Design a protein around this ligand. Structure first.
Ligand SMILES: [Zn+2]
Ligand SMILES: [Zn+2]
Ligand SMILES: [Zn+2]
Ligand SMILES: [Zn+2]
Ligand SMILES: [Zn+2]
Ligand SMILES: [Zn+2]
Ligand SMILES: [Zn+2]
Ligand SMILES: [Zn+2]
Ligand SMILES: [Zn+2]
Ligand SMILES: [Zn+2]
Ligand SMILES: [Zn+2]
Ligand SMILES: [Zn+2]
Ligand SMILES: [Zn+2]
Ligand SMILES: [Zn+2]
Ligand SMILES: [Zn+2]
Ligand SMILES: [Zn+2]
Ligand SMILES: [Zn+2]
Ligand SMILES: [Zn+2]
Ligand SMILES: [Zn+2]
Ligand SMILES: [Zn+2]
Ligand SMILES: [Zn+2]
Ligand SMILES: [Zn+2]
Ligand SMILES: [Zn+2]
Ligand SMILES: [Zn+2]
Ligand SMILES: [Zn+2]
Ligand SMILES: [Zn+2]
Ligand SMILES: [Zn+2]
Ligand SMILES: [Zn+2]
Ligand SMILES: [Zn+2]
Ligand SMILES: [Zn+2]
Ligand SMILES: [Zn+2]
Ligand SMILES: [Zn+2]
Ligand SMILES: [Zn+2]
Ligand SMILES: [Zn+2]
Ligand SMILES: [Zn+2]
Ligand SMILES: [Zn+2]
Ligand SMILES: [Zn+2]
Ligand SMILES: [Zn+2]
Ligand SMILES: [Zn+2]
Ligand SMILES: [Zn+2]
Ligand SMILES: [Zn+2]
Ligand SMILES: [Zn+2]
Ligand SMILES: [Zn+2]
Ligand SMILES: [Zn+2]
Ligand SMILES: [Zn+2]
Ligand SMILES: [Zn+2]
Ligand SMILES: [Zn+2]
Ligand SMILES: [Zn+2]
Ligand SMILES: [Zn+2]
Ligand SMILES: [Zn+2]
Ligand SMILES: [Zn+2]
Ligand SMILES: [Zn+2]
Ligand SMILES: [Zn+2]
Ligand SMILES: [Zn+2]
Ligand SMILES: [Zn+2]
Ligand SMILES: [Zn+2]
Ligand SMILES: [Zn+2]
Ligand SMILES: [Zn+2]
Ligand SMILES: [Zn+2]
Ligand SMILES: [Zn+2]
Ligand SMILES: [Zn+2]
Ligand SMILES: [Zn+2]
Ligand SMILES: [Zn+2]
Ligand SMILES: [Zn+2]
Ligand SMILES: [Zn+2]
Ligand SMILES: [Zn+2]
Ligand SMILES: [Zn+2]
Ligand SMILES: [Zn+2]
Ligand SMILES: [Zn+2]
Ligand SMILES: [Zn+2]
Ligand SMILES: [Zn+2]
Ligand SMILES: [Zn+2]
Ligand SMILES: [Zn+2]
Ligand SMILES: [Zn+2]
Ligand SMILES: [Zn+2]
Ligand SMILES: [Zn+2]
Lengths: 143, 143, 143, 143, 143, 143, 143, 143, 143, 143, 143, 143
């Protein structure tokens, strides 16, 4: 179900909002400003994704999740308890989670096509476009 | 300890970030736009508070919390599982949590004065100023 | 035919442009500013929809409609002759007409997919996205 | 009566809003961009005139017209059913309708002076100023 | 005399500047933000009216009033000592005072026409335009 | 005749454009910046007045003047051949020429009322408003 | 009591709002623009101070003053009935009243520290900062 | 293959970037400014298309082309060696090349649907939308 | 002498300021807007050139000209008494006068190099750059 | 000949436009964003240089080059076929090509001085200024 | 004494203004842009600190220092004569000097509390806030 | 040598940066704001001149000066130890130092022409242009 994948993704969005703030505060190295500013852009993107997924859920006549509790329960994103990083470790982690979201947005898109929910398709394909652009850029950082 | 109160408040900030999004999505009544836009301003404020508290913690040589897990563990904010509200219920809840943050920022301020951490004082008094302005406005909504 | 639905929708757009101005001028109640400003945003949206539908028609090698006469002839939107409203009546009427446009944009989208007119699809799905967001918000006003 | 002329003019404004969109979509010749952009400015002006006339009517304790139906009934503007133009034909038509509005705004102004409605006078003289500037520019196009 | 009415109006402007701040601080109800922001726009308008009337007086070779003392002495506006309101009470009061200013600006306009002071006429008619727009909007709030 | 006064004023506008540039370049004293910047605002105003008067003339079916030659022939403004000033001398000269334009705009306004040219009236009264504001400010400089 | 000093200062703010407008309209000399613009900045500052003091009072659970009447009753600011000034006289008067506000903001700050009202302290110290900057600048004008 | 069509289009984009600059520099006639500015907008669009196609190629794990050499080798766009034009000749040429890109973007879109590359579809349909709008406008210039 | 050429050019600048306004008001044809706006840019350029030449003269210890009288006396620009034009006639005239200014700025530049006035050289070469760009564009209009 | 060097440089500009896009897409390493953004600024500079050189050529009565074909024929810039880089390799390549352009702009400048083409001199010296600033910055990257 | 510490800090501010420009010009490595831009932000901050400290001194009735001579005499900042750096060396040096300013601003703050100079306290605590944020960021660069 | 004069001028720039701040803080008289703001513009100009001269030095393969120490050693600018001024004294001092910089920029320009350093010439002539404009304005203040 479309709204089930939406909920799952909403859960990842708020979890990544937090995870990315970790990287924002705890990066080390002459790389600090760039990663500090870039992580800020990343978590702000995730705050919007969170809101947008929730609002698609509501639009669709269902209930978005409303507690951090359900988010942790529905997410497939590993929270990061460590508190120190080189930029390369941050990019590897973010890349991993991006590849996860990419897979899921594809699923979201495929599922919504099947159920004749075209709006959810164009939302999912728009997010895929962004994820694939970032995936490429992150791959290029790490190469 | 100053950094202990900071951590506690950081936990409330991310919890209220979520709680306020609930109110953002699930308000009902001819009041919808105003509460939808106002809650958006409120949660954006909480996103900044979260970041700022975390960054004061780091500055002070300690570790801010880095998971939703610790946040739920350290918060004194009740998450809201209900998914429908009149504006009056939203304002009552927000008011309650504001009164909670007000008390704690006072504590933060008092404690930091004692430990000779003046920066943390001016941060705490700046946040008090905002909380007391909102507390007054919310009291005026409900009267 | 794609261009036939386009024409129909173009007719509704100019009719709603007028209808919404009625609500803009004739709302009553302590609700006045909010509804006055919101209706202004709504009719400005409809002015753009009108222009865009007409311009898709032209692009497609056909003729958009060019008189209020044809608009009244092609529309399924009831004009509103009454000249006084509470905000709730305005929202109910706007909701009704929105549900009408939603149905038709779905048709437009489905029909254009069939005829291999992909541009018209992405236009129709973009408008659906907006209509479904407003439909949800209006449902929330009225609940 | 002042409000009677206001209503008449309100009817012309919405009719010209449509008529001018015709010219916007259906101009032909190496003149296309200039006329396309200029007609867009013209119809946006007419959308404001429409709103302003309606709002003067309301202010004056009367009811502006609220349907395209009454507009077609009250207008002295010929709708244009043709769907192809050279720029010269567009300017001739617009000039004609401008000369019509000029005459009527003079009447509006004279009538409002008589009835001691000074606000309506300053509104009418402001619109005359604009019409006479455009009339001159259009005469210069055609010369 | 033109300058006598100017002085009277200048006195009302500063008195309403204060009166409107009362409403700004002391409104109660789920209406709070809207009335708080709208009253702020209203008193800022009155601050400009005050300055403009004073400056017309100076231009005309006379002396505007320069103390709150003369203002209270020359005003026909009742100061409001009460410190709590519903929005409806605020709108009724503002409406009353608006109707008062409307009457006086008409007088100002008529008197200035007689004395051949055309500048003061166009100033008075510009203010009438604004007062009549607000009077209509306030009537619509209360209906 | 309205257009005759317009032409006369157009001639003064271009003459004052030049005269004011003299003051702009040739002021002396610790007053230099203020007078340099203020004269720049003054001549830019005169450049617009020039254009606007010319364009009213054209609108009215007549020909504005098109050479400096006719301007010098039609102006009642004394050109200034001297090349050094204290600010007080500049203000006295500008004041004189302002009083001249004020008189003429009154004439323009009166004459246009008589001939039923309302647009030219509202133009003349708008310029009077500006001239009387500047006249007051200049009187205040010199007092 | 903190709120008692707040009220007193609120009274001075509205009185200085008026007093400063006097100086704004009635300054004489080649100094006119600078003093006209500077007084405009000064009274706009006082309008904000007025609003802010009133709003601190409300926040604190008390009632700000709501009439010009109480303002004149609570102020220690002498109103200025004279209607003509050299810039030096304006600066001397403003300086005097500034020194008065400086003393009182110190009192406000000291008193609020005692009562544990930290928000009011940071407000009072912020205003002191501004007053001491202006006091220095005004002393420099007069030296 | 999707990436093969992308590469082809990337080649056309840089070739049209140049071709359009030819028209930019070498248009003749009283049409000069309009065509000079419009061609500037057109080539800036092509510079972005070039970059975007290249970046989609990279995202997709392939290599965009990196020399003018490959571009000339992969393009189906005829370079223009002539150095003088009337606007009509420029529009005919641009129209031709647009019709070419339209065909190819359709192919791109169809092919990407087949291979399950949804991002490339939404990119191709977005570009089609723009090409069909320009095709219509250019047809209207030439009619 | 450098300052002699400066004065000559200053005279042409104010004469062209007027001449170009003629073209601004009196162009005829479907070309009207473009020429109306372009002439406005041209005369605004000439107003700046005028001011800049005058200010270079002053800088150099000499006196710029301060009357329209000297301008007409020092200019080699023919004033235009005719009051109706096709765009082609306007461009031919402007081109002629441009070729004149180009020649003179070359002279200015050469002369200033000789006298070791480098500032005047860089001013003259900057103006040449602009004149040669416009000369090319005007040649392209007329071809 | 001046125009011969201009043409040569125009050829390098479009070749570097492409070459720099290579570096834009194909940089690898934790350096990615900085080099991605900086290369974007560099190629945008080259797009302007290209246009400006072409337009100087036209101004000078000659024909700029109008095909990628002539560009490859006239350039002394080696195209880069490789598709992967560390930032250091990108900077070395860009530095090399910069040193090439620097030499040529000197030649351009010297040659134009000889032929009395001062405009082309000030253009060449302006570009030298930029090239020498970038050369220094690039040397500093590599040191 | 408060003003003695102010003077000392003023001396460091201008010395660091220079020192930081050294780092701005003489950094080496693929780090160049980031350090070049960041040092520019740092020295601009120091220019403001310098001005603000000087202006607090003046406000307090004392004399800020007015020569580079006294600055070198009063500073505890070592000037840097070396002319080449890796970014790590720049950050270590800046960190050292920051730790120095932090200590001194604490002293300033403590001393001003003692002397009842609250304005100087809030200034000192504001600067501490900034220094501690930068100290943390610099520590993070170097870790 | 070009770089020797550059260094000398760099030394004056930082010395004048300080000297001008003296005038900024210590001007007395009803002239205070104007001189306070103007000196702020002047020292900000000198901060840029300083940076630009240093960066030309680096570009040229030499080392700009990096301590206040060398600046005081290389400058021909007298530092000002006095701490109180009338505006006339400030303008006389600034004028003197300007005349000094003018002479030196001429030398810089002449020397750079000789050594074939054209970039340094265009930099020197640009600064001369500014110095001669300010010299004229300052002469006009003092006359
Ligand atoms: Zn941060
Ligand atoms: Zn951001
Ligand atoms: Zn939302
Ligand atoms: Zn997931
Ligand atoms: Zn750690
Ligand atoms: Zn490490
Ligand atoms: Zn929303
Ligand atoms: Zn927001
Ligand atoms: Zn942060
Ligand atoms: Zn808590
Ligand atoms: Zn529900
Ligand atoms: Zn309910
Ligand atoms: Zn309205
Ligand atoms: Zn709007
Ligand atoms: Zn359109
Ligand atoms: Zn329909
Ligand atoms: Zn009714
Ligand atoms: Zn009702
Ligand atoms: Zn889309
Ligand atoms: Zn369009
Ligand atoms: Zn528009
Ligand atoms: Zn409206
Ligand atoms: Zn009519
Ligand atoms: Zn047709
Ligand atoms: Zn035709
Ligand atoms: Zn008016
Ligand atoms: Zn407020
Ligand atoms: Zn406001
Ligand atoms: Zn004022
Ligand atoms: Zn009254
Ligand atoms: Zn109460
Ligand atoms: Zn109640
Ligand atoms: Zn100037
Ligand atoms: Zn200006
Ligand atoms: Zn004009
Ligand atoms: Zn006259
Ligand atoms: Zn002289
Ligand atoms: Zn004198
Ligand atoms: Zn004013
Ligand atoms: Zn202001
Ligand atoms: Zn307020
Ligand atoms: Zn007091
Ligand atoms: Zn008097
Ligand atoms: Zn006096
Ligand atoms: Zn161009
Ligand atoms: Zn552009
Ligand atoms: Zn790119
Ligand atoms: Zn192709
Ligand atoms: Zn040719
Ligand atoms: Zn031809
Ligand atoms: Zn115009
Ligand atoms: Zn313009
Ligand atoms: Zn000037
Ligand atoms: Zn000449
Ligand atoms: Zn004629
Ligand atoms: Zn003709
Ligand atoms: Zn990119
Ligand atoms: Zn860019
Ligand atoms: Zn171009
Ligand atoms: Zn080359
Ligand atoms: Zn590869
Ligand atoms: Zn590698
Ligand atoms: Zn730099
Ligand atoms: Zn900066
Ligand atoms: Zn300062
Ligand atoms: Zn120190
Ligand atoms: Zn070295
Ligand atoms: Zn190294
Ligand atoms: Zn603070
Ligand atoms: Zn200052
Ligand atoms: Zn500044
Ligand atoms: Zn720099
Ligand atoms: Zn020197
Ligand atoms: Zn002293
Ligand atoms: Zn003195
Ligand atoms: Zn230059």
């Amino acid at each position: 179900k479309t709204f089930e994948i939406l909920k799952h993704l909403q859960a990842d969005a708020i979890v990544l909002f937090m995870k990315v703030h970790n990287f924002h505060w705890n990066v080390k190295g002459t790389d600090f400003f760039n990663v500090h500013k870039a992580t800020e852009e990343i978590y702000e993107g995730f705050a919007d994704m969170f809101d947008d997924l929730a609002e698609r859920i509501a639009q669709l006549g269902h209930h978005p999740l409303v507690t951090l509790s359900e988010a942790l329960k529905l997410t497939r994103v590993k929270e990061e308890t460590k508190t120190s990083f080189h930029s390369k470790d941050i990019f590897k982690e973010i890349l991993e989670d991006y590849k996860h979201l990419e897979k899921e947005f594809k699923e979201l898109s495929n599922t919504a096509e099947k159920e004749g929910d075209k709006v959810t398709v164009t939302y999912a394909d728009d997010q895929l476009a962004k994820l694939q652009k970032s995936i490429w850029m992150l791959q290029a950082h790490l190469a």
